Design a protein around this nucleic acid. Structure first.
Ligand SMILES: [Mg+2]
Length: 1991
RNA sequence: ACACAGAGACGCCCAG
RNA sequence: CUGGGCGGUAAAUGU
RNA sequence: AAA
């Protein structure tokens, strides 16, 4: 029907109305039904509509014969949208548009139809249907639909002017129609007919949260893929296997037999492999092992030498660059031919070429060789190369073509063929690697060059001193001098000119040249000339070097450098080649060398400010780093990398021997470089040395240390940290390198090798159990047992209802997904049927498209929910029959990895399974890849459990594991069985089909690879894979994985890398749970039927795993038997691992005592080591961005990540200096002639996002972010004037200057003005935009409806707009193109200074022009920032000021060297936290004001107040969104939203590692340099005026927690508050102790008057507390949880509220709300939500009260009173207050009535708020307060130690009870004893005070004593536990920071004896002559003298 | 020179 | 043998 | 007293 006539026949009067319900009934007779054929599939449901039966009543004319399609998701609401088909205009609007904003929370609610009438009236009609036959049901539905809408519509119309609205509702059932809408009878009859058809079709076919749940549930209920088609298509995809796996139980007898067999096999391997039997001495055993290792190394060397040329002596250079080190000079080109050019030609073809090259340059035309500054200066304020063609004689061309400059044309002749045949040769191990050996130990790299006076050093020093102007202390000068000394060196200058050469080559990389011509160019500073012959930009580029040979002042020593040809006066070099990938390391060379020098000098103990000769060890590390960076080969990295695995075996304890000869499987391979031969020889020597003897464990007092550590490459013995960091030297290589076509055959070899052996019989692939499986089989019963064990664990931890919660979570996570979430920049494959066959796509080019294009078509098709697009993708995959995969290579710091790109439909299908697997993995207590908090929890908390259960002196045993081929080896049926086991039986079909689609993998190959492959039919070659591939492609031989003439490789086994990550993690978790259950079951038993006591902890990731087991022995013999038993248990795992599909790798290290590694984190007892070299190396991998500020912020992020790995602040400062040098070099330092003018002009105006580089304070360098440095710069230098002018123009006070104003604010609090234009990907990005076809006027459409940038959005055009603004994002879309960032940045930096390439935020101007415009600019504004502007711009400026004022306490380099702290743990230092007074968020405030949706929890009155404050800040703001755009200085709402969202405070948390732990002062004193203390010098006058409240908190803590009576405490509090001055309170909504202190001071001073008004104003109208408190529940080590039934009573916005709460165990919940007066309720709701989330209680728990009330409240959302859940909302003097002090609690208690206590404020001092600076401030004012009179005060009130006579007087006070004013007895003694005990434990002596069996789920031949002889005994060592759980317990004492008894213990230890004290605390023994002196300390210990027994 | 237990690049398209 | 015109790829799953 |  129509709506126009229906709305026209409605008369609307002024106001609101509801009409009267008109009950309608059927009148005309009804025909039966048209034909309604309905079928269901994955696409949808098809509704075939037949012909309506004919009748005279014209019923059925609305329908039309045909077919109707409905998607599966919305099949639940079929009656509603088919009975009411039509009659709706769609484009559903909300109440926010036509009605104004009321801020009631009901704005998000929208009706079905909303009609703006032709005369302006508003009519809203609501539809409702029901399958009932009673009139009462229709009346109930009508009343419900009336009442759920009447109240909010009334509230909306009782405010808007001239309201004329009408509300209607239509209820249609199968028995009648009830509606207030006047309708004709025929309309009712046709609606009845449509309802009958709708419910017939439904019977035949059968809040946003609830809608998503219903949609997902309906989809999974109606989804039915044909199982038979899957079984006919995919192998081993029968549901019978799944049903059998879920049906039959396990066979326990088979499990027992298999366990016994594998146990005896493991025992046999352990006994025979490690030479256990017969009896032998340990020395004999290690000698036999060493002989075996020597034999294996020798036969490997012989086998490697067999397939090689002999070639004992060979001439080659590992470094291609010459060792020249010339002095820098000016940029003046000088030929200066003195001996004549004639002496050059008669020295070879190189001499002829160089003579002919220099002769042309001698004949004028010097332009092009050196840039002209004049031309650049006149062009900028308003790339020419010197090409030449020499003679090129034929012999010269031949000799040059030998090097490969023109190798294609000169390929035929015999010399080039000989060279090509010789190139394919592998060098021999016996090559006499001699020069490399003595180059490392003896080199002159670290000798000072005495060059620190030239122009480059002058420029960098000028820039450094300009950057360090803000911080002008002595420390900065010392660190700058150290950096300059590092800069002045031979290696650094060599790297500088090498990097200049590399930048020049990268600039000249893309310059096409004709045949026979070259380019000559001179470097800017050094007198070095290069001749460049460039080929294609992707291909090689050639160069030769020439020097005067009279200007080479210095030269590096060593023979590793390549030979240089001498030609008379000039020295020349041959033609070498590089690519784009190899230029990365050459550019970043000087920064790399500076970082390495600083890092190793700091690590070797040399202080930065000292000057010493270099050590022998230092030169080895720096030379090795230099050689590795220069050679840049992939094979060289592996040898150094495997040193970690071959060296980790030295920690293995008895009875296992260290066997590093397992690593020979990867050391084999070709050796094409001399350096690789040297590294292999040193690796074998280290292997032999490791196999000879293990590492020595020395159990000293308490601590555990390892001895005999040494460096792998050079046999020098070092510390442990040096070895761990030397394990990672191989990371000094370019991670990304290009792949050539003769390569890439290794990938296909890795793919096909596993697939060759697949068991043909499928009986052991899930069908049945078997022992001793093959390379792919597994046992079903073991999987059943593991799944049952993990299910038992989950049911134990997460209760018995975990399955239903998991189902609801899965449905919620899958129901809310849109297509726009899936769209991203990730690539996808276009491989299809037409690409399969060759010889038809040979003359075509294959390309990969982004997922954005594939999702844009789906979005514009008309689907938005992800749950709608799964069916089409699944059907398309099933029809195609195979998953289609593309391949490429990802190069990493390790072995090569194959990466699988995936099709779009396959990705869409895989997303849901990945989501389900993640949801299942979120519950496991062992898995860590989805629970990142667990990896730092399981390892650290093992010590606590070991100490708590077993007791003190436990012995730990650990094992670290890995997997050979995790991606391969896994048959997908196992994963499917596990997932279906862990699911509630409704997802089973979908998971089974989505897994079964995997086993038809078809992987493409490169088309050029096949194009070169098809030409050749004979393979030759020495490897079988090439012959097999050639014969299979040509069809000569037949293989299963590839057929004739196809472009795809077909496999059947394995899962790809990462595609099924979470499912593999779940399987690994099941296996580890089974292992733990088996281990504890066997640990219950013991040797000879004993009972070994211990604890087993297990942790795992994707493939990595770790087992930690600790036991406690009582004697020696049982200790040795227990350790042998544990060795057996840890050795059986590698034989239990063939069961399932694990196949544990060779890199696993087993049976180590006090060490365990997991995810590259090494725990060595209480010393935690993290390799920081891997982060220091990666400190220059910046990303391409639109602005320079983003480059600086990326530098800051990399520096922070480097600091978090663990490094001193001096090292961080030096790394920041290196980053500054790198940035300034990237900004055209050595590529543009006008950089000197640029810096000389820039030093006047330092400006971030303009060219200047800000630098941090040396004391605190990495913790502070970029905003802190911006704030310091704005408050220190002239940047504040420009920022003030910019912000004033933003305010609108200063108008004009349309193009001068800055609007775009980059993330990080940096508003920007300009952006560079020239992007290489910009044309590609434009093409990408063209091929998707977005609307052009997206900004015009987004300004019309701005409410889509703040909501989820539902309209299709809304989604198109959101996608359009997603593509046009400034950062992500333009930056994720990626590539080799550094070479392209270098190439663009040759013209960035002087060329029009910057765009305003349309004239394009140079950087110098931008500097001139900024000169005629805000520099003339001359105004500073006011506190309002600073508070708006920096929302955390107070924390910045506090940190800065604390920071300047350290300004001088004075300190003492101390012993290094040997207890390293992690920490979480919180700083720069979110402000408490801000009370709101800008974006949330704007969203709530403009669109009325609940973002912030602020009431409408507070919203009005904050809006008035913001309007005071910004004048052009207004409630109407459209008014703000034109009035304000903004172009579009996108820019406004970006500007608003960018400037908002974010909390900054650092995670330092070091000694356990103001705290900033402690971490800046300890971590400045290891073994050194910074020793800050404080100023007295600062802390009293900066934070006087901290002194008050200190005094309050030391008074309340102290030995004082209550009256004395009251008087002390009164006088302390009277003496100090406290600022006035600030209004906050979050509870704070500072505000309570201010209120307490104002109350006791009585200055504010009515204290209740002040309290309610400070807490924003909130008053009250607990009338009946809640009884406490003792918590296991924490504050007592308040449980029971209680009441919260108070006032809130002039309303007498009363809240009833209840809780049980975990949290409290709302029970009942009683309120005095309704008035406005919404402010009450927001206030009570703030109270609830401040006190931690929840609203989700349902209430049992079913009685009558006014409204319901559930989940902090208002609900109609008809519904039954949620909390009911039923409506029901300053002289009385006083001071009351409880135990460590202050309260302003004021009882409401007699019989109960009513307190309204709280304050408990803690252990944090104690400062030594506050104690010193109290010491200066010792006579001011009353505490200076007696001895307990001035020592307990202040913080100081106790003197000898002082503690003697204290002891004689202790001996007698006496009576002293407010001093007390027996409690002062308690705190004294606690302080003395804590002081005792710090120095030593006194020790710090501190299951899923398998059954319910289901000898003595060795000498032992001899095989464990010669080993230390560990139970007699008394070694402590490790982990942060133990460490944090020892600091739990409240009086930890007390020095009141340290000197007492120092004096007592000497007089008593180190062993004597321990005997005293155990046996109570002492001798009399020292008893006379320890008797005062015996009364301090409160131990009687008659009890202690004398010796 | 680069890559590789010899699968490739060492310019490509034209026009005469 | 000359002469003219140039543009690529590179990017996978998760927190 | 605390999340
Ligand atoms: Mg592995």
């Amino acid at each position: 029907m129509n709506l126009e006539v229906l709305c026209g026949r409605i008369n609307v009067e002024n106001g609101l109305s509801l009409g009267e319900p008109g009950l309608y009934d059927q009148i005309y007779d009804r025909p039966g039904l048209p034909d309604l054929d309905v079928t269901v599939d994955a696409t949808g449901v098809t509704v075939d509509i037949g012909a309506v039966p004919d009748s005279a009543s014209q019923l059925g004319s609305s329908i039309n014969a045909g077919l109707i399609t409905i998607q599966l998701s919305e099949a639940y609401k079929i009656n509603h949208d088919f009975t009411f088909s039509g009659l709706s205009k769609t484009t559903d609007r909300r109440l926010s548009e036509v009605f104004p904003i009321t801020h009631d929370g009901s704005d998000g609610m929208t009706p079905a139809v909303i009609h703006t009438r032709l005369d302006g009236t508003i009519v809203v009609v609501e539809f409702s249907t029901t399958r009932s036959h009673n009139i009462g049901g229709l009346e109930a539905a009508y009343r419900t639909k009336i009442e759920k809408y009447r109240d909010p519509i009334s509230r909306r119309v009782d405010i808007m002017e001239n309201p004329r609205v009408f509300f209607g509702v239509i209820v249609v059932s199968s028995g009648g129609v009830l509606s207030n809408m006047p309708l004709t009878q025929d309309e009712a009859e046709e609606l009845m007919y449509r309802f009958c058809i709708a419910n017939e079709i439904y019977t035949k076919a059968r809040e946003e949260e609830l809608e998503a749940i219903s949609r997902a549930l309906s989809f999974f209920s109606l989804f039915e893929p044909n199982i038979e088609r899957v079984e006919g298509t995919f192998p081993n995809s029968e549901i019978k296997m799944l049903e059998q796996f879920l049906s039959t139980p396990a066979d326990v007898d088979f499990i027992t037999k298999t366990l016994k067999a594998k146990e005896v096999e493991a025992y046999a391997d352990l006994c025979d492999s490690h030479y256990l039997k017969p009896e032998k001495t340990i020395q004999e055993r290690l000698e036999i092992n060493r002989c075996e290792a020597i034999d294996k190394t020798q036969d490997l060397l012989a086998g490697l030498h067999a397939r090689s040329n002999k070639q004992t002596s060979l001439n080659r250079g590992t470094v291609k660059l010459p060792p020249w080190l010339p002095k820098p000079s000016s940029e003046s080109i000088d030929i200066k031919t003195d001996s004549g050019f004639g002496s050059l030609m008669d020295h070879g073809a190189y001499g002829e070429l160089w003579a002919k090259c220099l002769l042309d340059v001698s004949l004028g035309n010097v332009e092009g060789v050196v840039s002209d500054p004049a031309k650049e200066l006149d062009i900028a304020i308003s790339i020419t190369y010197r090409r030449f063609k020499p003679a090129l004689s034929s012999s010269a061309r031949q000799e040059f073509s030998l090097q490969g400059v023109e190798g294609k044309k000169w390929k035929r002749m015999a010399a080039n063929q000989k060279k090509e045949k010789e190139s394919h040769e592998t060098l021999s191990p016996f090559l006499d690697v001699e020069d490399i050996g003595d180059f490392l130990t003896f080199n002159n790299l670290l000798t000072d060059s005495r060059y620190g006076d030239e122009s480059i050093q002058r420029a960098v020093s000028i820039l450094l001193e300009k950057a360090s102007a803000m911080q002008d202390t002595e420390l900065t000068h010392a660190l700058n001098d150290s950096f300059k000394r590092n800069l002045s060196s031979n290696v650094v200058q060599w790297s500088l000119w090498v990097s200049c050469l590399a930048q020049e080559l990268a600039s000249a990389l893309k310059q096409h040249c004709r045949a026979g011509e070259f380019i000559i160019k001179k470097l800017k500073f050094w007198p070095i000339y290069v001749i460049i012959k460039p080929t294609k930009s992707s291909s090689h580029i050639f160069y030769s070097l020439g020097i005067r040979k009279a200007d080479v002042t210095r030269r590096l020593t060593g023979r590793v450098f390549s030979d240089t040809i001498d030609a008379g006066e000039w020295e020349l070099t041959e033609f070498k080649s590089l690519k784009t990938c190899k230029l990365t390391n050459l550019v970043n060379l000087p920064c790399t060398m500076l970082n390495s020098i600083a890092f190793w000098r700091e690590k070797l103990g040399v202080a930065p400010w000292l000057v010493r000769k270099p050590c022998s060890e230092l030169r080895e590390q720096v030379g090795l780093t230099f050689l590795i960076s220069l050679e840049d080969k992939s094979k060289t990295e592996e040898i150094i990398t495997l040193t970690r695995y071959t060296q980790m075996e030295g920690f293995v304890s008895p009875p296992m021997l260290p066997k590093p000869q397992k690593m020979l499987g990867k050391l084999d391979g070709p050796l094409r470089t001399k350096l690789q031969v040297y590294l292999l020889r040193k690796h074998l020597d280290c292997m032999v040395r490791i196999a000879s003897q293990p590492f020595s464990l020395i159990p000293r007092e308490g601590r555990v240390e390892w001895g005999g550590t040494f460096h792998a490459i050079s046999g020098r013995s070092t510390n442990l940290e040096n070895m761990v960091n030397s394990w990672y030297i191989g990371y000094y290589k370019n991670k990304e390198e290009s792949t050539e076509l003769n390569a890439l055959g290794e990938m296909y070899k890795k793919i096909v090798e596993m697939e060759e052996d697949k068991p043909s019989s499928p009986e052991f692939l899930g069908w049945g159990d078997t022992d001793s499986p093959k390379k792919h089989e597994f046992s079903r019963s073991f999987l059943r047992a593991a799944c049952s064990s993990l299910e038992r664990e989950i049911a134990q931890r997460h209760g018995r209802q975990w399955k239903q919660n998991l189902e609801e979570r899965v449905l919620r996570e899958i129901g809310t997904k849109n297509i726009l979430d899936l769209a991203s920049m990730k690539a996808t494959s276009n491989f299809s049927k037409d690409w399969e066959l060759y010889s038809e796509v040979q003359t075509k080019e294959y390309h990969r498209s982004k997922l954005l294009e594939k999702m844009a078509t789906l979005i514009e098709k008309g689907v938005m929910w992800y749950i709608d697009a799964v069916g089409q993708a699944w059907k398309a995959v099933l029809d195609d029959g195979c998953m289609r995969i593309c391949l490429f290579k990802k190069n990493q710091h390790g072995g090569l990895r194959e990466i699988y790109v995936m099709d779009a439909n396959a990705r869409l299908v895989q997303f849901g399974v990945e989501t389900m697997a993640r949801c299942v993995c979120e519950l496991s207590p062992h898995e860590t890849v989805a629970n990142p908090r667990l990896k730092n929890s399981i390892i650290e908390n093992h010590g606590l459990k070991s100490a708590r259960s077993l007791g003190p002196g436990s012995i730990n045993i650990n094992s670290s594991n890995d997997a050979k081929k995790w991606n391969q080896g896994h048959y997908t049926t196992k994963l499917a069985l596990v997932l279906c086991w862990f699911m509630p039986a409704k997802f089973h079909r979908f998971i089974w089909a989505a897994i079964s689609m995997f086993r038809r993998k078809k992987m493409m190959v490169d088309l050029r690879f096949l194009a070169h492959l098809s030409s050749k039919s004979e393979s030759r070659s020495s490897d079988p894979f090439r012959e097999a591939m050639t014969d299979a492609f040509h069809g000569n031989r037949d293989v299963s994985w590839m057929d004739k003439g196809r472009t795809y490789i077909k496999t059947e086994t394995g899962m790809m890398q990462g595609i099924l990550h979470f499912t593999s993690s779940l399987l690994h978790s099941c296996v580890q749970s089974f292992y733990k259950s088996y281990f504890v079951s066997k640990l219950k038993e013991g040797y000879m039927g004993e009972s070994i006591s211990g604890v087993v902890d297990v942790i795992e990731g994707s493939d990595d795993s770790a087992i930690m087991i600790s036991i406690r022995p009582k004697s020696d013999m049982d200790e040795v038997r227990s350790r042998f038993f544990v060795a057996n248990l840890l050795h059986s795992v590698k034989f239990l691992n063939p069961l399932f599909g694990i196949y544990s790798s060779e890199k696993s290290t087993v049976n180590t005592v006090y060490c365990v590694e997991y995810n590259s984190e090494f725990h060595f007892h209480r010393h935690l080591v993290r390799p920081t070299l891997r982060w220091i190396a990666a400190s220059h991998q910046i990303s391409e961005t639109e602005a320079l500020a983003s480059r600086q912020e990326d530098y800051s992020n990399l520096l922070t990540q480097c600091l978090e790995g663990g490094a001193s602040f001096s090292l961080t400062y030096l790394i920041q200096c290196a980053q500054l040098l790198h940035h300034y070099m990237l900004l055209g330092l050595c590529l543009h002639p006008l950089f000197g003018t640029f810096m000389g002009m820039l030093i006047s105006d330092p400006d971030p996002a303009l060219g200047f580089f800000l630098m941090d304070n040396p004391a605190f360098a990495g913790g502070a972010g970029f905003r802190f440095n911006l704030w310091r710069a704005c408050k220190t230098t002239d940047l504040g004037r420009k920022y003030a002018y910019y912000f004033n123009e933003i305010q609108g006070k200063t108008k004009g200057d349309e193009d001068y104003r800055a609007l775009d604010a980059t993330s990080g609090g940096t508003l920007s003005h300009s952006v560079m234009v020239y992007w290489g990907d910009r044309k590609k990005y434009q093409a990408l935009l063209n091929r998707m076809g977005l609307p052009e006027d997206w900004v015009e459409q987004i300004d019309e409806n701005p409410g889509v940038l703040y909501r989820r959005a539902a309209n299709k055009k809304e989604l198109l707009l959101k996608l359009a603004e997603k593509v046009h994002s400034p950062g992500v879309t333009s930056s994720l193109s990626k590539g080799h960032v550094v070479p392209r940045v270098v190439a663009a930096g040759v013209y960035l200074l002087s060329r029009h390439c910057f765009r305003f935020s349309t004239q394009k101007a140079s950087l110098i022009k931008l500097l001139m415009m900024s000169s005629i600019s805000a520099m003339k504004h001359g105004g500073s920032l006011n506190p309002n502007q600073e508070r708006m711009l920096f929302p955390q400026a107070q924390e910045y000021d506090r940190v800065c004022t604390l920071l300047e306490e350290v300004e001088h380099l004075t300190g003492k060297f101390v012993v290094r702290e040997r207890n390293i743990v992690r920490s979480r230092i919180d700083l720069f936290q979110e402000p408490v007074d801000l009370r709101c968020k800008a974006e949330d405030l704007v969203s709530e004001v403009w669109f009325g949706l609940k973002r912030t929890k602020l009431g409408p009155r507070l919203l009005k107040e904050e809006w008035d404050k913001l309007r005071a800040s910004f004048a052009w703001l207004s409630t109407d969104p459209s008014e703000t755009l034109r009035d304000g200085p903004f172009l579009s709402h996108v820019q406004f939203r970006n500007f608003i969202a960018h400037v908002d405070a974010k909390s900054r948390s650092v995670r330092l590692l070091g000694a356990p732990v103001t705290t900033i002062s402690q971490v800046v004193r300890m971590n400045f340099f290891p073994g050194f203390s910074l020793e800050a010098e404080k100023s007295l006058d600062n802390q009293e005026r900066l934070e006087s409240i901290s002194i008050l908190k200190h005094v309050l803590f030391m008074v309340l927690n102290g030995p004082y009576t209550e009256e004395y405490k009251l008087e002390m509090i009164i006088e302390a508050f009277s003496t100090l001055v406290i600022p006035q309170p600030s209004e906050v909504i979050r509870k704070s102790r500072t505000m309570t202190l201010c209120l307490l001071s104002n109350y006791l001073s009585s200055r504010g008057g009515s204290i209740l008004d002040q309290i309610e104003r400070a807490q924003s109208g909130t008053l009250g507390g607990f009338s009946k408190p809640q009884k406490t529940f003792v918590r296991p080590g924490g504050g007592v949880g308040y449980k029971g039934k209680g009441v919260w009573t108070g006032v809130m916005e002039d309303t007498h509220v009363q809240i009833l709460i209840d809780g049980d165990g975990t949290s409290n919940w709302l029970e009942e709300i009683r309120l005095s007066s309704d008035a406005r309720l919404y402010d009450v709701i927001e206030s009570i939500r703030r109270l609830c989330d401040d006190l931690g209680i929840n609203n989700r728990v349902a209430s049992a009260y079913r009685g009558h009330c006014m409204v319901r409240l559930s989940g902090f959302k208002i609900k109609p009173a008809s519904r039954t859940d949620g909390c009911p909302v039923r409506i029901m003097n300053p002289d009385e207050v006083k001071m009351r002090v409880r135990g460590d609690i202050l309260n302003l208690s004021v009882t409401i009535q007699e019989g109960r206590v009513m307190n309204i404020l709280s304050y408990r001092p803690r252990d944090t708020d104690i400062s030594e600076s506050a104690a010193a401030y109290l010491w200066s004012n010792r006579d001011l307060f009353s505490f200076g009179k007696k001895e307990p005060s001035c020592s307990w009130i202040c913080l100081k130690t106790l003197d000898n006579w002082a503690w003697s007087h204290a002891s004689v006070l202790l001996a007698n009870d006496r009576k002293t004013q407010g001093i007390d007895n027996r409690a002062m003694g308690n705190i004294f004893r606690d302080c003395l005990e804590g002081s005792l434990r710090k120095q030593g002596l006194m020790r710090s005070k501190l299951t899923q069996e398998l059954v319910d789920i289901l000898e003595g031949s060795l000498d032992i004593e001899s095989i464990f002889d010669g080993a230390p005994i560990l139970w007699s060592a008394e070694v402590e536990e490790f982990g942060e759980g133990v460490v944090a317990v020892s600091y739990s004492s409240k009086y930890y920071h007390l020095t009141l008894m340290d000197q007492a213990a120092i004096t007592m230890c000497a007089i008593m004896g180190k062993e004597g004290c321990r005997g005293l605390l155990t046996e109570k023994r002492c001798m009399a002559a020292i008893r006379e002196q320890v008797r005062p300390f015996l009364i301090f210990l409160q131990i009687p003298e008659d009890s202690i027994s004398w010796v």
